[PDB]
Amino acid sequence: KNMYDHTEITTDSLLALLGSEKVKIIDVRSADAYNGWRMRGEVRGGHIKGAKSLPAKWLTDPEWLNIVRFKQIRPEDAIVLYGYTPEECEQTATRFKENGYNNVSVFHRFHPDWTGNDAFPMDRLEQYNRLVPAEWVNGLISGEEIPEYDNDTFIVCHAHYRNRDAYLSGHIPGATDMDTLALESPETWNRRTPEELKKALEEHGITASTTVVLYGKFMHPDNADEFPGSAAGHIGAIRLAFIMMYAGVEDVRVLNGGYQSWTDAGFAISKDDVPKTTVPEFGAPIPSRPEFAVDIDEAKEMLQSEDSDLVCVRSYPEYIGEVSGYNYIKKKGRIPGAIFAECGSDAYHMENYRNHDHTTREYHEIEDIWAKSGIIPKKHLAFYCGAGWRGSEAWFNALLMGWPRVSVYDGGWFEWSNDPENPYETGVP
Ligand SMILES: C[N+](C)(C)[C@@H](Cc1cnc[nH]1)C(=O)O
Ligand SMILES: [Cl-]
Ligand SMILES: [Cl-]
Ligand SMILES: [Mg+2]
């Protein structure tokens, strides 16, 4: 065993192992490349079919070994690493060997050999171009040619909940801030009326034909604060992406991992308070995509329909009625008949849908876990949570997979429990 010299596996050998249950093929490129972005100009992007994502970026994470174990990558597995180059794999190969993995090989010919021949199977996140890497945003704001972009009008929007300091403390150059209160009402925590959305989008400089790039800043939400949501900026960004896509912005992108991805890439930060450039007319009837939103009467119908389900994206203490999740909800319990899809640790964290760096979790893992609960694309799914934020992030993950009938039930537990006639469950199921 040599911690620093790694066996090469040939293309022929790896081809013969694609179906092996005992082989784990590990893509150490960025998660955005794994999803399908052609980050080196390859003609076919994505990953080797069956490969898992383990970005070499994560080697500096003190919890690296726990990430690997949670991915079910075990020492008895044969580990095959690849990246754009075998040199990109060397540190990861050594890290596996230092932690008791004795069967570790490096595949040298993923690019250009594997990517370049159409008989070598690859996979990709179907709608990966909605989930953009920092390098794409940098090219956009620099006026440079970038893939998956044919527009001439864009805006980069920094989302926050009543927390302008989230933006003023550091933001992507030229970006403007959007408080989530611009597009959702504090009375209902639902999306605002069409007339309000039209005015708010126009005042923020957004037309239906503007490419809107949304991101937020994660600032370590604390349940002891009056407004922990003010620190969950990137959930808020995906919430606004949902409302904008519902409203009719044709081209909405989300920066994968939010602000952390921008600074991790080494790009310059701005603290300017950028004034808005208003536009006079949104340019499309609102809402253009009403099917993206489900309200309570439709949600009740979906609970009675075989081809439909509500998907509860809340924490386990919320689900069993231990806590409400919120300092503004007193009632505790759950909507009867929903399928549980645990979000993470509480209302302000999405650990089960994210990596430690806040990029979206490897989509195969989300897909496979969902399938175990019957959360599958042949259904009409309405994702929901307390009041729509976490549900929007789950919804966006399904949208990225190309699922054809996914919605957010906007009202969530807030609306449901606000009517004392609605039934609810509590306790361990
Ligand atoms: C709808 N507001 C903005 C009031 C929510 C947003 C939210 C974040 N994670 C769950 N919900 C809140 O901050 O509690
Ligand atoms: Cl966040
Ligand atoms: Cl619930
Ligand atoms: Mg709501």
Side-chain angles (χ1 to χ4, degrees):
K1 182 174 178 178
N2 193 323
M3 299 284 178
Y4 305 108
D5 182 63
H6 313 302
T7 301
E8 168 177 7
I9 184 172
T10 66
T11 303
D12 283 347
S13 301
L14 186 57
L15 249 189
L17 295 180
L18 286 180
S20 174
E21 292 182 303
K22 300 170 176 311
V23 176
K24 301 298 173 64
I25 306 177
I26 308 297
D27 189 332
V28 305
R29 297 173 311 150
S30 75
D32 302 299
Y34 178 93
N35 289 341
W37 287 96
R38 301 170 306 99
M39 299 298 285
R40 305 267 165 108
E42 62 269 36
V43 288
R44 289 196 311 160
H47 44 281
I48 297 184
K49 186 172 190 304
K52 295 201 60 77
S53 176
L54 191 78
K57 165 191 170 167
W58 301 353
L59 287 170
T60 58
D61 190 327
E63 299 286 351
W64 181 92
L65 181 55
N66 279 328
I67 299 173
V68 168
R69 289 172 169 178
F70 186 29
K71 284 183 178 283
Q72 304 272 73
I73 300 158
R74 306 153 298 179
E76 62 264 28
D77 293 331
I79 308 316
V80 174
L81 305 169
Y82 74 90
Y84 280 119
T85 69
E87 290 80 8
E88 291 172 19
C89 301
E90 282 177 30
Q91 285 183 329
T92 297
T94 292
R95 184 67 69 79
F96 272 104
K97 286 180 173 175
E98 295 171 337
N99 286 279
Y101 293 71
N102 298 330
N103 190 344
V104 179
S105 307
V106 174
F107 177 47
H108 294 216
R109 299 313 281 172
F110 168 73
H111 182 63
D113 293 43
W114 197 283
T115 59
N117 194 294
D118 72 354
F120 288 119
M122 291 184 69
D123 206 355
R124 64 192 60 75
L125 182 58
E126 182 188 296
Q127 299 290 325
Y128 71 85
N129 64 11
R130 300 314 218 262
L131 181 64
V132 298
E135 295 85 338
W136 183 96
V137 180
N138 184 50
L140 181 70
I141 70 182
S142 298
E144 273 143 26
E145 289 301 294
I146 51 180
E148 306 298 318
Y149 179 69
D150 308 316
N151 210 350
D152 60 5
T153 309
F154 73 89
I155 188 153
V156 184
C157 284
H158 184 140
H160 60 89
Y161 172 47
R162 57 180 295 158
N163 187 17
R164 294 209 75 231
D165 173 69
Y167 165 77
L168 301 165
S169 58
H171 62 81
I172 296 183
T176 46
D177 65 308
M178 185 179 281
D179 195 322
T180 56
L181 288 168
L183 302 195
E184 70 184 356
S185 164
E187 181 165 29
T188 58
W189 297 121
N190 277 0
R191 66 211 187 274
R192 294 186 179 274
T193 65
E195 296 69 28
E196 297 173 274
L197 296 176
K198 182 180 186 292
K199 181 173 189 293
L201 292 165
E202 289 162 358
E203 292 169 342
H204 286 77
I206 293 168
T207 69
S209 62
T210 300
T211 295
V212 176
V213 181
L214 278 155
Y215 78 98
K217 184 182 300 187
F218 175 90
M219 303 171 74
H220 297 269
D222 183 339
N223 284 302
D225 289 321
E226 185 178 4
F227 300 110
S230 292
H234 200 59
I235 308 179
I238 299 170
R239 168 69 165 172
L240 295 191
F242 161 74
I243 297 175
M244 289 193 195
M245 285 183 266
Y246 157 84
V249 179
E250 303 189 37
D251 180 9
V252 176
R253 314 290 178 112
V254 172
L255 172 57
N256 193 14
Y259 183 72
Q260 185 179 326
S261 294
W262 186 258
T263 62
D264 279 0
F267 292 129
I269 297 150
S270 181
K271 287 164 176 277
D272 292 347
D273 192 350
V274 180
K276 267 65 172 182
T277 300
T278 70
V279 297
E281 291 295 336
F282 183 68
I286 294 177
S288 288
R289 304 296 293 278
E291 72 272 18
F292 285 163
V294 159
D295 291 310
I296 191 167
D297 294 308
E298 182 171 10
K300 285 171 174 178
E301 208 165 86
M302 297 174 68
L303 290 168
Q304 305 294 317
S305 300
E306 292 296 317
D307 73 333
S308 293
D309 280 292
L310 309 188
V311 177
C312 170
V313 188
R314 297 176 72 203
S315 70
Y316 184 73
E318 289 169 85
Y319 185 70
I320 66 176
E322 254 168 22
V323 301
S324 74
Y326 299 92
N327 66 20
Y328 57 89
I329 301 183
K330 178 173 213 56
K331 289 185 60 172
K332 308 188 264 176
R334 62 176 172 274
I335 301 185
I339 304 175
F340 188 47
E342 190 170 331
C343 72
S345 55
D346 59 26
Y348 298 101
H349 297 82
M350 295 285 291
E351 295 99 330
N352 289 334
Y353 291 83
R354 297 188 174 186
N355 302 310
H356 290 176
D357 65 4
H358 303 294
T359 55
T360 64
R361 176 181 189 174
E362 180 185 310
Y363 69 93
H364 295 297
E365 291 172 7
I366 302 176
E367 206 154 39
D368 288 350
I369 292 164
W370 275 348
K372 297 298 201 257
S373 297
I375 298 169
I376 53 170
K378 87 159 194 70
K379 291 176 176 184
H380 178 198
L381 299 167
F383 297 89
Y384 76 94
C385 52
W389 275 38
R390 292 174 283 174
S392 297
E393 181 162 342
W395 167 87
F396 189 61
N397 275 284
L399 190 77
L400 290 169
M401 300 167 190
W403 288 21
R405 290 193 298 165
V406 288
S407 308
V408 174
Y409 161 45
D410 201 356
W413 175 247
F414 182 77
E415 178 184 50
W416 187 274
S417 67
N418 276 344
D419 179 354
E421 296 304 322
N422 285 331
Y424 62 100
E425 294 167 348
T426 200
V428 180

